[PDB]
Scaffold this active site. Sequence first.
Site, PDB file in Angstrom:
ATOM      1  N   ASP A 121       0.846  -1.174  -0.007  1.00  0.00           N
ATOM      2  CA  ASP A 121      -0.090   0.038   0.013  1.00  0.00           C
ATOM      3  C   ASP A 121       0.821   1.249   0.093  1.00  0.00           C
ATOM      4  N   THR A 159      -6.696   3.631  -1.720  1.00  0.00           N
ATOM      5  CA  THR A 159      -6.334   2.284  -1.488  1.00  0.00           C
ATOM      6  C   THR A 159      -7.545   1.065  -2.125  1.00  0.00           C
ATOM      7  N   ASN A 180     -12.772   5.920  -0.859  1.00  0.00           N
ATOM      8  CA  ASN A 180     -12.786   5.223   0.498  1.00  0.00           C
ATOM      9  C   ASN A 180     -13.746   5.502   1.302  1.00  0.00           C
ATOM     10  N   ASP A 261       2.552   2.770   2.981  1.00  0.00           N
ATOM     11  CA  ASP A 261       1.460   3.939   3.061  1.00  0.00           C
ATOM     12  C   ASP A 261       1.240   4.299   4.612  1.00  0.00           C
ATOM     13  N   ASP A 308      -0.635  -0.142  -4.944  1.00  0.00           N
ATOM     14  CA  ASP A 308      -1.896   0.473  -5.100  1.00  0.00           C
ATOM     15  C   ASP A 308      -1.980   1.796  -5.911  1.00  0.00           C
ATOM     16  N   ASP A 683     -21.268  11.837 -25.977  1.00  0.00           N
ATOM     17  CA  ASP A 683     -21.388  10.672 -24.998  1.00  0.00           C
ATOM     18  C   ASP A 683     -22.257  11.577 -23.774  1.00  0.00           C
ATOM     19  N   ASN A 685     -24.438  10.342 -22.001  1.00  0.00           N
ATOM     20  CA  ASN A 685     -24.771   9.821 -20.810  1.00  0.00           C
ATOM     21  C   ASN A 685     -23.704   9.360 -19.828  1.00  0.00           C
ATOM     22  N   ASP A 687     -21.128   7.466 -19.856  1.00  0.00           N
ATOM     23  CA  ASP A 687     -20.751   6.199 -19.907  1.00  0.00           C
ATOM     24  C   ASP A 687     -19.005   5.605 -20.410  1.00  0.00           C
ATOM     25  N   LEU A 689     -18.922   5.526 -23.442  1.00  0.00           N
ATOM     26  CA  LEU A 689     -19.616   4.667 -24.961  1.00  0.00           C
ATOM     27  C   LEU A 689     -20.264   5.384 -25.778  1.00  0.00           C
TER      28      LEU A 689
HETATM   29  C1  LIG Z   1     -15.535  -1.133 -18.739  1.00  0.00           C
HETATM   30  O1  LIG Z   1     -15.852  -2.509 -18.486  1.00  0.00           O
HETATM   31  C2  LIG Z   1     -17.262  -3.083 -18.146  1.00  0.00           C
HETATM   32  C3  LIG Z   1     -17.715  -4.255 -18.184  1.00  0.00           C
HETATM   33  O2  LIG Z   1     -17.430  -4.922 -19.477  1.00  0.00           O
HETATM   34  C4  LIG Z   1     -18.293  -2.385 -19.004  1.00  0.00           C
HETATM   35  O3  LIG Z   1     -19.490  -2.232 -18.284  1.00  0.00           O
HETATM   36  C5  LIG Z   1     -20.799  -2.896 -18.678  1.00  0.00           C
HETATM   37  O4  LIG Z   1     -21.182  -2.235 -19.827  1.00  0.00           O
HETATM   38  C6  LIG Z   1     -22.746  -2.612 -20.444  1.00  0.00           C
HETATM   39  C7  LIG Z   1     -23.230  -1.534 -20.902  1.00  0.00           C
HETATM   40  O5  LIG Z   1     -23.238  -0.255 -20.248  1.00  0.00           O
HETATM   41  C8  LIG Z   1     -23.530  -3.243 -19.140  1.00  0.00           C
HETATM   42  O6  LIG Z   1     -24.436  -3.735 -19.869  1.00  0.00           O
HETATM   43  C9  LIG Z   1     -25.975  -3.701 -19.158  1.00  0.00           C
HETATM   44  O7  LIG Z   1     -26.231  -4.964 -18.306  1.00  0.00           O
HETATM   45  C10 LIG Z   1     -27.380  -4.687 -17.701  1.00  0.00           C
HETATM   46  C11 LIG Z   1     -27.585  -5.965 -16.845  1.00  0.00           C
HETATM   47  O8  LIG Z   1     -26.935  -5.409 -15.844  1.00  0.00           O
HETATM   48  C12 LIG Z   1     -26.664  -6.671 -14.568  1.00  0.00           C
HETATM   49  O9  LIG Z   1     -25.642  -7.516 -15.092  1.00  0.00           O
HETATM   50  C13 LIG Z   1     -24.227  -7.467 -15.232  1.00  0.00           C
HETATM   51  C14 LIG Z   1     -23.596  -8.492 -15.517  1.00  0.00           C
HETATM   52  O10 LIG Z   1     -23.295  -9.573 -14.658  1.00  0.00           O
HETATM   53  C15 LIG Z   1     -23.762  -6.752 -13.895  1.00  0.00           C
HETATM   54  O11 LIG Z   1     -22.493  -6.862 -13.940  1.00  0.00           O
HETATM   55  C16 LIG Z   1     -24.493  -5.669 -13.591  1.00  0.00           C
HETATM   56  O12 LIG Z   1     -23.540  -4.886 -12.650  1.00  0.00           O
HETATM   57  C17 LIG Z   1     -23.816  -3.601 -12.279  1.00  0.00           C
HETATM   58  O13 LIG Z   1     -24.799  -3.138 -11.462  1.00  0.00           O
HETATM   59  C18 LIG Z   1     -24.750  -3.527 -10.131  1.00  0.00           C
HETATM   60  C19 LIG Z   1     -25.942  -3.188  -9.350  1.00  0.00           C
HETATM   61  O14 LIG Z   1     -26.292  -1.866  -9.446  1.00  0.00           O
HETATM   62  C20 LIG Z   1     -23.282  -3.167  -9.518  1.00  0.00           C
HETATM   63  O15 LIG Z   1     -22.902  -3.972  -8.436  1.00  0.00           O
HETATM   64  C21 LIG Z   1     -22.023  -3.196 -10.434  1.00  0.00           C
HETATM   65  O16 LIG Z   1     -20.946  -2.263  -9.939  1.00  0.00           O
HETATM   66  C22 LIG Z   1     -22.465  -2.657 -11.856  1.00  0.00           C
HETATM   67  O17 LIG Z   1     -22.710  -1.322 -11.971  1.00  0.00           O
HETATM   68  C23 LIG Z   1     -22.300  -0.468 -13.018  1.00  0.00           C
HETATM   69  O18 LIG Z   1     -22.617  -0.670 -14.159  1.00  0.00           O
HETATM   70  C24 LIG Z   1     -24.521  -0.362 -14.171  1.00  0.00           C
HETATM   71  C25 LIG Z   1     -24.863  -0.793 -15.491  1.00  0.00           C
HETATM   72  O19 LIG Z   1     -25.150  -2.132 -15.394  1.00  0.00           O
HETATM   73  C26 LIG Z   1     -24.211   1.295 -13.955  1.00  0.00           C
HETATM   74  O20 LIG Z   1     -25.453   1.497 -13.728  1.00  0.00           O
HETATM   75  C27 LIG Z   1     -23.525   1.738 -12.671  1.00  0.00           C
HETATM   76  O21 LIG Z   1     -23.378   2.976 -12.806  1.00  0.00           O
HETATM   77  C28 LIG Z   1     -22.011   0.932 -12.612  1.00  0.00           C
HETATM   78  O22 LIG Z   1     -21.256   1.594 -13.262  1.00  0.00           O
HETATM   79  C29 LIG Z   1     -25.904  -5.684 -13.455  1.00  0.00           C
HETATM   80  O23 LIG Z   1     -26.280  -6.271 -12.047  1.00  0.00           O
HETATM   81  C30 LIG Z   1     -28.446  -4.804 -18.926  1.00  0.00           C
HETATM   82  O24 LIG Z   1     -29.915  -4.503 -18.116  1.00  0.00           O
HETATM   83  C31 LIG Z   1     -28.426  -3.596 -19.805  1.00  0.00           C
HETATM   84  O25 LIG Z   1     -29.252  -3.868 -21.014  1.00  0.00           O
HETATM   85  C32 LIG Z   1     -29.982  -2.707 -21.394  1.00  0.00           C
HETATM   86  O26 LIG Z   1     -29.575  -1.986 -22.612  1.00  0.00           O
HETATM   87  C33 LIG Z   1     -29.726  -2.693 -23.734  1.00  0.00           C
HETATM   88  C34 LIG Z   1     -29.306  -1.940 -24.890  1.00  0.00           C
HETATM   89  O27 LIG Z   1     -28.659  -2.854 -26.103  1.00  0.00           O
HETATM   90  C35 LIG Z   1     -31.171  -3.438 -23.757  1.00  0.00           C
HETATM   91  O28 LIG Z   1     -31.086  -4.541 -24.614  1.00  0.00           O
HETATM   92  C36 LIG Z   1     -31.876  -3.998 -22.803  1.00  0.00           C
HETATM   93  O29 LIG Z   1     -33.408  -3.642 -22.885  1.00  0.00           O
HETATM   94  C37 LIG Z   1     -31.617  -3.093 -21.400  1.00  0.00           C
HETATM   95  O30 LIG Z   1     -32.444  -1.686 -21.664  1.00  0.00           O
HETATM   96  C38 LIG Z   1     -33.444  -1.828 -20.440  1.00  0.00           C
HETATM   97  O31 LIG Z   1     -32.927  -1.201 -19.374  1.00  0.00           O
HETATM   98  C39 LIG Z   1     -32.624   0.286 -19.469  1.00  0.00           C
HETATM   99  C40 LIG Z   1     -31.952   0.748 -18.320  1.00  0.00           C
HETATM  100  O32 LIG Z   1     -32.915   0.706 -17.098  1.00  0.00           O
HETATM  101  C41 LIG Z   1     -34.351   0.951 -19.915  1.00  0.00           C
HETATM  102  O33 LIG Z   1     -33.812   2.290 -20.269  1.00  0.00           O
HETATM  103  C42 LIG Z   1     -34.846   0.432 -21.157  1.00  0.00           C
HETATM  104  O34 LIG Z   1     -36.041   0.858 -21.248  1.00  0.00           O
HETATM  105  C43 LIG Z   1     -34.574  -1.235 -20.934  1.00  0.00           C
HETATM  106  O35 LIG Z   1     -35.768  -1.504 -20.367  1.00  0.00           O
HETATM  107  C44 LIG Z   1     -27.044  -3.704 -20.546  1.00  0.00           C
HETATM  108  O36 LIG Z   1     -26.977  -4.528 -21.358  1.00  0.00           O
HETATM  109  C45 LIG Z   1     -22.740  -4.017 -18.263  1.00  0.00           C
HETATM  110  O37 LIG Z   1     -23.587  -4.256 -16.936  1.00  0.00           O
HETATM  111  C46 LIG Z   1     -21.534  -3.457 -17.678  1.00  0.00           C
HETATM  112  N1  LIG Z   1     -20.834  -4.280 -16.787  1.00  0.00           N
HETATM  113  C47 LIG Z   1     -20.243  -3.891 -15.806  1.00  0.00           C
HETATM  114  C48 LIG Z   1     -19.333  -4.923 -14.783  1.00  0.00           C
HETATM  115  O38 LIG Z   1     -20.151  -2.650 -15.417  1.00  0.00           O
HETATM  116  C49 LIG Z   1     -17.850  -0.656 -19.290  1.00  0.00           C
HETATM  117  O39 LIG Z   1     -18.782  -0.348 -20.304  1.00  0.00           O
HETATM  118  C50 LIG Z   1     -16.339  -0.445 -19.771  1.00  0.00           C
HETATM  119  N2  LIG Z   1     -16.312   0.789 -19.629  1.00  0.00           N
HETATM  120  C51 LIG Z   1     -15.689   1.435 -20.827  1.00  0.00           C
HETATM  121  C52 LIG Z   1     -15.502   2.983 -20.825  1.00  0.00           C
HETATM  122  O40 LIG Z   1     -15.523   0.614 -21.803  1.00  0.00           O
HETATM  123  C1  LIG Z   2      -5.001  -7.864  -5.700  1.00  0.00           C
HETATM  124  C2  LIG Z   2      -6.605  -7.704  -5.378  1.00  0.00           C
HETATM  125  C3  LIG Z   2      -6.498  -7.459  -3.890  1.00  0.00           C
HETATM  126  C4  LIG Z   2      -5.473  -7.424  -3.102  1.00  0.00           C
HETATM  127  C5  LIG Z   2      -5.660  -7.373  -1.571  1.00  0.00           C
HETATM  128  C6  LIG Z   2      -6.716  -6.855  -1.148  1.00  0.00           C
HETATM  129  O1  LIG Z   2      -7.091  -6.464   0.340  1.00  0.00           O
HETATM  130  C7  LIG Z   2      -5.942  -6.670   0.929  1.00  0.00           C
HETATM  131  C8  LIG Z   2      -6.292  -6.330   2.362  1.00  0.00           C
HETATM  132  N1  LIG Z   2      -5.997  -7.203   3.589  1.00  0.00           N
HETATM  133  N2  LIG Z   2      -6.249  -6.339   4.636  1.00  0.00           N
HETATM  134  C9  LIG Z   2      -6.427  -5.125   4.268  1.00  0.00           C
HETATM  135  O2  LIG Z   2      -6.688  -4.004   5.093  1.00  0.00           O
HETATM  136  N3  LIG Z   2      -6.493  -5.002   2.935  1.00  0.00           N
HETATM  137  C10 LIG Z   2      -6.858  -3.783   2.161  1.00  0.00           C
HETATM  138  C11 LIG Z   2      -7.972  -6.467  -2.031  1.00  0.00           C
HETATM  139  O3  LIG Z   2      -8.939  -6.095  -1.572  1.00  0.00           O
HETATM  140  C12 LIG Z   2      -9.996  -6.724  -0.730  1.00  0.00           C
HETATM  141  C13 LIG Z   2     -10.089  -8.121  -0.974  1.00  0.00           C
HETATM  142  C14 LIG Z   2     -11.303  -8.983  -0.330  1.00  0.00           C
HETATM  143  C15 LIG Z   2     -11.174 -10.163  -0.400  1.00  0.00           C
HETATM  144  N4  LIG Z   2     -11.434 -11.419  -0.677  1.00  0.00           N
HETATM  145  C16 LIG Z   2     -12.263  -8.092   0.270  1.00  0.00           C
HETATM  146  C17 LIG Z   2     -12.206  -6.662   0.334  1.00  0.00           C
HETATM  147  C18 LIG Z   2     -13.264  -5.819   1.015  1.00  0.00           C
HETATM  148  C19 LIG Z   2     -12.919  -5.067   2.309  1.00  0.00           C
HETATM  149  C20 LIG Z   2     -13.658  -6.263   2.316  1.00  0.00           C
HETATM  150  C21 LIG Z   2     -11.198  -6.032  -0.448  1.00  0.00           C
HETATM  151  C22 LIG Z   2      -7.695  -6.894  -3.298  1.00  0.00           C
HETATM  152  F1  LIG Z   2      -8.677  -6.435  -4.019  1.00  0.00           F
HETATM  153 CA   LIG Z   3     -22.678   7.182 -24.225  1.00  0.00          CA
HETATM  154 CL   LIG Z   4     -12.634   9.410  -1.074  1.00  0.00          CL
HETATM  155 ZN   LIG Z   5      -2.972   5.841   2.577  1.00  0.00          ZN
END
Ligand SMILES: *[C@@H]1O[C@H](CO)[C@@H](O[C@@H]2O[C@H](CO)[C@@H](O[C@@H]3O[C@H](CO[C@H]4O[C@H](CO)[C@@H](O)[C@H](O[C@H]5O[C@H](CO)[C@@H](O)[C@H](O)[C@@H]5O[C@H]5O[C@H](CO)[C@@H](O)[C@H](O)[C@@H]5O)[C@@H]4O)[C@@H](O)[C@H](O[C@H]4O[C@H](CO)[C@@H](O)[C@H](O)[C@@H]4O[C@H]4O[C@H](CO)[C@@H](O)[C@H](O)[C@@H]4O)[C@@H]3O)[C@H](O)[C@H]2NC(C)=O)[C@H](O)[C@H]1NC(C)=O
Ligand SMILES: CCc1ccc(OCc2n[nH]c(=O)n2C)c(Oc2cc(C#N)cc(C3CC3)c2)c1F
Ligand SMILES: [Ca+2]
Ligand SMILES: [Cl-]
Ligand SMILES: [Zn+2]
EC number: 3.1.4.39
Length: 804
Positions: A121, A159, A180, A261, A308, A683, A685, A687, A689
């Site tokens: 760290d 971190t 954080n 760190d 990190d 862009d 929205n 995103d 993209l």
């Molecule tokens: C960097 O890499 C990542 C990963 O490759 C890229 O992100 C992907 O981009 C895709 C497009 O943005 C996106 O695809 C969507 O998936 C939807 C399903 O979502 C769930 O399933 C996935 C897969 O396991 C999961 O990972 C998702 O997790 C997100 O949300 C949870 C809980 O909220 C979080 O824990 C997690 O962190 C993550 O959040 C992030 O992404 C979401 C969006 O998913 C953001 O809201 C957050 O801000 C955050 O950044 C989900 O659990 C799916 O529903 C979508 O489909 C819609 O659009 C298509 C158009 O083609 C259509 O077919 C469908 O009808 C649907 O539209 C409907 O819903 C609309 C919205 O409500 C509505 O307006 C319409 O009317 C429709 O009814 C979509 O396909 C994919 O999820 C993410 N993956 C991840 C991991 O983030 C990222 O783009 C890359 N970045 C760059 C710059 O390159």
């Molecule tokens: C290389 C990738 C990587 C290495 C090390 C990582 O933590 C190492 C770690 N030890 N103790 C501590 O204070 N720190 C930050 C790590 O962060 C997490 C890992 C897990 C799991 N399993 C769960 C969490 C969240 C807090 C609950 C975070 C991480 F992503």
């Molecule tokens: Ca866009």
């Molecule tokens: Cl912060």
């Molecule tokens: Zn620090």
Amino acid sequence: WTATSGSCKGRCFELQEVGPPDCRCDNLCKSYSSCCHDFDELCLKTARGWECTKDRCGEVRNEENACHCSEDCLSRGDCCTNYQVVCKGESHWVDDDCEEIKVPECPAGFVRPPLIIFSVDGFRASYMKKGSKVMPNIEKLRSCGTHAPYMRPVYPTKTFPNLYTLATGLYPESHGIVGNSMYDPVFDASFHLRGREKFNHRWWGGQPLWITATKQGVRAGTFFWSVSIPHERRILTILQWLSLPDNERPSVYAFYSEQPDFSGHKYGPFGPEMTNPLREIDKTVGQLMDGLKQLRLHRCVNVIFVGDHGMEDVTCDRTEFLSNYLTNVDDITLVPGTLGRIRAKSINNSKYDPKTIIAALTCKKPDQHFKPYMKQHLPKRLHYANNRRIEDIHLLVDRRWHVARKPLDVYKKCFFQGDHGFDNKVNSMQTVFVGYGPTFKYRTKVPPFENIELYNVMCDLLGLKPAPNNGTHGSLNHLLRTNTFRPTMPDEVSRPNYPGIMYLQSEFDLGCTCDDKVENKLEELNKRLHTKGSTKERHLLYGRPAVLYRTSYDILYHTDFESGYSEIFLMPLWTSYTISKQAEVSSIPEHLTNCVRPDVRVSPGFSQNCLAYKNDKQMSYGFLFPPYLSSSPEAKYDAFLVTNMVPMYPAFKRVWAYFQRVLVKKYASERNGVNVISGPIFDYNYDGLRDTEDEIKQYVEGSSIPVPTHYYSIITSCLDFTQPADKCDGPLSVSSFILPHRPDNDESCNSSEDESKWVEELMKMHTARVRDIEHLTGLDFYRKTSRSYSEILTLKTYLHTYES
Ligand SMILES: *[C@@H]1O[C@H](CO)[C@@H](O[C@@H]2O[C@H](CO)[C@@H](O[C@@H]3O[C@H](CO[C@H]4O[C@H](CO)[C@@H](O)[C@H](O[C@H]5O[C@H](CO)[C@@H](O)[C@H](O)[C@@H]5O[C@H]5O[C@H](CO)[C@@H](O)[C@H](O)[C@@H]5O)[C@@H]4O)[C@@H](O)[C@H](O[C@H]4O[C@H](CO)[C@@H](O)[C@H](O)[C@@H]4O[C@H]4O[C@H](CO)[C@@H](O)[C@H](O)[C@@H]4O)[C@@H]3O)[C@H](O)[C@H]2NC(C)=O)[C@H](O)[C@H]1NC(C)=O
Ligand SMILES: CCc1ccc(OCc2n[nH]c(=O)n2C)c(Oc2cc(C#N)cc(C3CC3)c2)c1F
Ligand SMILES: [Ca+2]
Ligand SMILES: [Cl-]
Ligand SMILES: [Zn+2]
Ligand code: NA
Ligand code: NA
């Protein structure tokens, strides 16, 4: 509730998570206050310390000892890491010459080389050189393995966002750990570093490496260590897991150090107190390597030494107070420190106004050490907007400074000399990468790269398919001896049309005029050839970009530039032109100041019109291929085609004109010619993209001409600058930007001054990877070079930082 009355006997540091309320014996139980009553007695032994001494050699096993020096300890897998050295005449790993590991040399039953991620760290990149005298083990990994001079973290340079980026290959906006500290408005829940709240699954998006491994049948050691477990014990636990039988043994492991760190915050990044923490880390590394050597694993395991983020000098007196700016300071909530995030204190207060907060924070003091942004206006290279946990109002804080709400926050919370969190291109925030083992290259230095790329390689090292992520898989193939991932170029989705002359001048009613009626078979066959693409190999040097989505577009050739013109968006998606070192800049002649010319290859109905720009009092226009760089007076007319025009706020035209008139030519001088590809980005929205046509929030008034959010350029030349850009045999060199298309220059506090004082500063702040432009445009660049695809992928991830 935990029934702590169960026992850890034979369960110390078990890999399964046992379910509540039964007591746990895993490396996480401390954090949950759920360890069995005897966890400390059995699992955290300390007796006699961590090293064998001569008099312990061949001792009778005493199970109370932290580690063992008894003749049986090797089969038990619980010797002190120095057992072989002290008791068996062996050398420390660090004292052994390095010798290339051409093939894995693994004991029987090892199916693949195990991966050990050693994460530190706050380990600033410059520690590798500046501390190298006190870190002989780390220096051996760095010099004998594969190392970068630094590795770029993600923003914010904090971190958890950075560790979880390492774990997932995702930007914080996508993985969800955007600081954080966080408020999630959907869950109405706050994330803090203290307590068990941070463990809740809802915070953590994407798929971290340990889950990726598990899902695909590769067992993982646990990556989180409770703070109170000493490092010697973390190392002993990993080594113990490594002596498990085949069926039970993990293939991927993580060690974590809170140092340097911890000390860096207290002492500053180069405080004299920092030598000790660096020695201590090195010793821990030496323990691990010695332990692997004992297990006969030191030429089998791939080790990753990775940080990190770095550490910068920051002190209490270098704090900006929002109370010096805002009248209403008690109506805001601020997330403070090395970044600022602002939201309304109460969502019931309808006298809250972001526009007035931003304006009160903008260029208000001459030395002002932070800059306010709506998050959509943040440099796109940061990818820090697309998450509901990121507040709309953001403060980018200058390196070495803090932002706080009020002075009392800083003295009723100097007590620190270091901090981190700043913009991820700041040199003091860069961190470290070294890879060592059979799969890594031998004595190899690789250029700096971004931590978002590591997840893919960690998956490669373990034979796993990575979950979808923000790395560019293959971009780090040059780190690896074997296990490379050989991607194919994506297929083009839309093929271009190649329109010839199809329209007469009078079919257009665009309300444009040009004083162009100033006009030979010698010089006309020639002009025809240009329009057919006779000069295309000069201007389109790496092939046409491929369009990776369904759309309708025309390739348009000209003497000086080639474009891919979208009939959907009524403007080029891209405009490609080469400017040699010898090229000369000219002005727009007096008679051509307002010249816009219908393009007889493109229908009226798929053209912009000049009436729209006349009627829109906020919007003007510019051109993608610059009229200033025309190769002849006759060629200049091509630059005024309606098909080369793009909508531009007057304020933005200040920036664009200076780039086109002054900078392109400066880059051609310095770089021996440049090839330029420029275009619009939509862009709305935020995103990261490409927007679809139905996502566009703004048009030139009264028309269907969509307004770009950003304009990009990709500037390519020969890495060997003795070769001109258009006759380059070898590797390429690139810089790119994605400039926000804004109606004002409020971002640039010096913008009432001459463009030579502020415009290039803006551009540098908006520096970009070609890859960032690919995501924002649906285009794929560099399709035809003589370079390997992996090299091109590396080029596409390159970021020109302008740090020294
Ligand atoms: C960097 O890499 C990542 C990963 O490759 C890229 O992100 C992907 O981009 C895709 C497009 O943005 C996106 O695809 C969507 O998936 C939807 C399903 O979502 C769930 O399933 C996935 C897969 O396991 C999961 O990972 C998702 O997790 C997100 O949300 C949870 C809980 O909220 C979080 O824990 C997690 O962190 C993550 O959040 C992030 O992404 C979401 C969006 O998913 C953001 O809201 C957050 O801000 C955050 O950044 C989900 O659990 C799916 O529903 C979508 O489909 C819609 O659009 C298509 C158009 O083609 C259509 O077919 C469908 O009808 C649907 O539209 C409907 O819903 C609309 C919205 O409500 C509505 O307006 C319409 O009317 C429709 O009814 C979509 O396909 C994919 O999820 C993410 N993956 C991840 C991991 O983030 C990222 O783009 C890359 N970045 C760059 C710059 O390159
Ligand atoms: C290389 C990738 C990587 C290495 C090390 C990582 O933590 C190492 C770690 N030890 N103790 C501590 O204070 N720190 C930050 C790590 O962060 C997490 C890992 C897990 C799991 N399993 C769960 C969490 C969240 C807090 C609950 C975070 C991480 F992503
Ligand atoms: Ca866009
Ligand atoms: Cl912060
Ligand atoms: Zn620090
Ligand atoms: Na106008
Ligand atoms: Na300004």
